[PDB]
Design an enzyme around this catalytic site. Structure first.
Site, PDB file in Angstrom:
ATOM      1  N   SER A   1      -2.875   2.605  -6.085  1.00  0.00           N
ATOM      2  CA  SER A   1      -2.598   2.467  -4.824  1.00  0.00           C
ATOM      3  C   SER A   1      -3.625   2.915  -3.730  1.00  0.00           C
ATOM      4  O   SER A   1      -4.482   3.848  -3.946  1.00  0.00           O
ATOM      5  CB  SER A   1      -1.488   3.813  -4.517  1.00  0.00           C
ATOM      6  OG  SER A   1      -0.340   3.256  -5.123  1.00  0.00           O
TER       7      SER A   1
ATOM      8  N   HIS B   1       1.536   5.311   2.194  1.00  0.00           N
ATOM      9  CA  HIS B   1       2.243   6.013   1.007  1.00  0.00           C
ATOM     10  C   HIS B   1       1.287   7.158   0.331  1.00  0.00           C
ATOM     11  O   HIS B   1       1.807   7.806  -0.463  1.00  0.00           O
ATOM     12  CB  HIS B   1       2.780   5.244   0.392  1.00  0.00           C
ATOM     13  CG  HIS B   1       2.200   4.420  -1.068  1.00  0.00           C
ATOM     14  ND1 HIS B   1       1.879   3.232  -0.973  1.00  0.00           N
ATOM     15  CD2 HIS B   1       1.659   4.912  -2.192  1.00  0.00           C
ATOM     16  CE1 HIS B   1       0.912   3.002  -1.746  1.00  0.00           C
ATOM     17  NE2 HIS B   1       0.882   4.031  -2.725  1.00  0.00           N
TER      18      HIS B   1
ATOM     19  N   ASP C   1       2.209  -0.814   5.013  1.00  0.00           N
ATOM     20  CA  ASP C   1       1.606   0.396   4.015  1.00  0.00           C
ATOM     21  C   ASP C   1      -0.064   0.246   4.206  1.00  0.00           C
ATOM     22  O   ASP C   1      -0.621  -0.173   3.387  1.00  0.00           O
ATOM     23  CB  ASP C   1       2.203   0.297   2.635  1.00  0.00           C
ATOM     24  CG  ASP C   1       1.837   1.205   1.776  1.00  0.00           C
ATOM     25  OD1 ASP C   1       1.427   2.473   2.188  1.00  0.00           O
ATOM     26  OD2 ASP C   1       2.108   0.760   0.622  1.00  0.00           O
TER      27      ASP C   1
HETATM   28  C1  LIG Z   1       1.778   1.158  -7.770  1.00  0.00           C
HETATM   29  C2  LIG Z   1       2.302   0.205  -8.740  1.00  0.00           C
HETATM   30  C3  LIG Z   1       3.346   0.497  -9.330  1.00  0.00           C
HETATM   31  C4  LIG Z   1       3.954   2.030  -9.430  1.00  0.00           C
HETATM   32  N1  LIG Z   1       5.148   1.862  -9.022  1.00  0.00           N
HETATM   33  C5  LIG Z   1       6.071   2.749  -9.996  1.00  0.00           C
HETATM   34  O1  LIG Z   1       5.284   2.894 -10.823  1.00  0.00           O
HETATM   35  C6  LIG Z   1       7.469   2.655  -9.489  1.00  0.00           C
HETATM   36  C7  LIG Z   1       8.483   3.411 -10.515  1.00  0.00           C
HETATM   37  O2  LIG Z   1       9.759   3.640 -10.268  1.00  0.00           O
HETATM   38  O3  LIG Z   1       7.904   4.167 -11.422  1.00  0.00           O
HETATM   39  C8  LIG Z   1       7.938   2.225  -8.352  1.00  0.00           C
HETATM   40  N2  LIG Z   1       7.320   1.680  -7.594  1.00  0.00           N
HETATM   41  C9  LIG Z   1       7.904   1.279  -6.167  1.00  0.00           C
HETATM   42  C10 LIG Z   1       8.378   0.147  -6.375  1.00  0.00           C
HETATM   43  C11 LIG Z   1       9.338  -0.400  -5.151  1.00  0.00           C
HETATM   44  C12 LIG Z   1       9.007   0.306  -4.044  1.00  0.00           C
HETATM   45  N3  LIG Z   1       9.984  -0.100  -3.002  1.00  0.00           N
HETATM   46  C13 LIG Z   1      10.261  -1.530  -2.644  1.00  0.00           C
HETATM   47  C14 LIG Z   1      10.622  -1.447  -1.227  1.00  0.00           C
HETATM   48  N4  LIG Z   1      10.855  -0.194  -0.943  1.00  0.00           N
HETATM   49  C15 LIG Z   1      10.599   0.497  -2.088  1.00  0.00           C
HETATM   50  O4  LIG Z   1      10.893   1.808  -2.296  1.00  0.00           O
HETATM   51  C16 LIG Z   1       8.485   1.607  -3.874  1.00  0.00           C
HETATM   52  C17 LIG Z   1       7.743   2.164  -5.164  1.00  0.00           C
HETATM   53  C18 LIG Z   1       5.864   1.676  -7.607  1.00  0.00           C
HETATM   54  O5  LIG Z   1       4.909   0.988  -6.912  1.00  0.00           O
HETATM   55  C19 LIG Z   1       3.856  -0.315 -10.255  1.00  0.00           C
HETATM   56  C20 LIG Z   1       3.370  -1.563 -10.653  1.00  0.00           C
HETATM   57  C21 LIG Z   1       2.407  -1.959  -9.789  1.00  0.00           C
HETATM   58  C22 LIG Z   1       1.637  -1.105  -8.795  1.00  0.00           C
HETATM   59  C23 LIG Z   1       0.536  -1.697  -8.083  1.00  0.00           C
HETATM   60  F1  LIG Z   1       0.346  -2.721  -8.368  1.00  0.00           F
HETATM   61  F2  LIG Z   1       1.121  -1.559  -6.880  1.00  0.00           F
HETATM   62  F3  LIG Z   1      -0.417  -0.799  -8.218  1.00  0.00           F
END
Ligand SMILES: Cc1c(Cn2c(=O)c(C(=O)O)cn(-c3ccc(N4CCNC4=O)cc3)c2=O)cccc1C(F)(F)F
Ligand SMILES: *[C@@H]1O[C@H](CO)[C@@H](O[C@@H]2O[C@H](CO)[C@@H](O)[C@H](O)[C@H]2NC(C)=O)[C@H](O)[C@H]1NC(C)=O
Ligand SMILES: *[C@@H]1O[C@H](CO)[C@@H](O)[C@H](O)[C@H]1NC(C)=O
Ligand SMILES: [Zn+2]
Length: 215
Positions: free
Chosen positions: A171, A45, A89
């Site tokens: 990420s 991603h 990913d």
């Molecule tokens: C990157 C990060 C995030 C960031 N993040 C978001 O901030 C955010 C939002 O809505 O702002 C959504 N998502 C997110 C959540 C779910 C998805 N999935 C689930 C299955 N297919 C999807 O599209 C995609 C993106 C994030 O990863 C949040 C918690 C911890 C961390 C990390 F631990 F991985 F670093």
């Protein structure tokens, strides 16, 4: 990195800072790590039109001699990476040149460590300095609420009773357990409520070695 501590400068010399460029939006940022002198492992991603890798950074706003800003010539996204589910990913970045080996730049229920330059809070900006946090490896059922989580493909990481977490901008960076990379920061909740989903590197080791021996 939420709830962590600023790393000793250059104590994690494999850490890479990715500045990703898109044709229609401003720069995005991810982590990653140097596994070979000319290869960085990150999250798929984090793919874009072009990527610059900065090795040897701590304070990413203060240029220093440790820095190596390296061009990426090709992006190797997992051929099965799915943008909806975020399965697979994982991505390899081939560097234009082999990086120099320096003191600041080199290759790489249990508790694990993750480092990055991401935000220190939901409404906090990205970090100037590289930060690290200790997180718990969880049973898969703790990530059940992520409906597309899969135990064979992914690690479940972060005690929900703590605020400690990777977050936006972390990420692509490695989860290290007892000295070895096991995971890649993938995704979690917008409210940074642990746990989060990480790519399980071991599943992809055959694929990684296929790309490395072909390039
Ligand atoms: C990157 C990060 C995030 C960031 N993040 C978001 O901030 C955010 C939002 O809505 O702002 C959504 N998502 C997110 C959540 C779910 C998805 N999935 C689930 C299955 N297919 C999807 O599209 C995609 C993106 C994030 O990863 C949040 C918690 C911890 C961390 C990390 F631990 F991985 F670093
Ligand atoms: C990282 O480097 C930046 C840029 O050199 C530092 O920014 C300074 O921050 C202080 C407050 O702490 C400001 O008053 C200065 O005006 C800033 N200077 C510049 C030139 O921007 C930042 O503090 C550093 N962060 C670290 C080492 O944690
Ligand atoms: C991704 O996953 C969805 C839902 O699981 C699936 O229907 C679709 O074929 C996949 N799409 C791509 C482009 O990989
Ligand atoms: Zn330095």
């Amino acid at each position: 990195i939420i709830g962590g501590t600023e790393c000793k400068p250059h104590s994690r010399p494999y850490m890479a800072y990715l500045e990703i460029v898109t044709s229609n939006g401003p720069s995005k940022f991810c982590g990653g790590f140097l596994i070979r002198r000319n290869f960085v492992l990150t999250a798929a991603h984090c793919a874009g039109r072009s990527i610059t890798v900065t090795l040897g950074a701590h304070n990413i706003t203060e240029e220093e001699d440790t820095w190596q800003k390296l061009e990426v010539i090709k992006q190797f996204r997992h051929p099965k990476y799915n943008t909806s589910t975020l399965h697979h990913d994982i991505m390899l970045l081939k560097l234009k040149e082999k990086a120099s080996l320096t003191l600041a730049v080199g290759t790489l229920g249990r508790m694990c460590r993750v480092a990055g330059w991401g935000r220190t809070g939901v409404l906090k900006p990205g970090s100037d300095t590289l930060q690290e946090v200790k997180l718990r490896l969880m049973d898969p059922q703790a990530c059940s609420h992520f409906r597309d989580f899969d135990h064979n493909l992914q690690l479940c990481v972060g005690n929900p009773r703590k605020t400690k977490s990777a977050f936006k901008g972390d990420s692509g960076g490695p989860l290290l357990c007892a000295g070895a990379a096991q995971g890649i920061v993938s995704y979690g909740r917008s409210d940074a409520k642990p746990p989060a989903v990480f790519t399980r590197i071991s599943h992809y080791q055959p694929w990684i070695n296929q790309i490395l021996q072909a390039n």
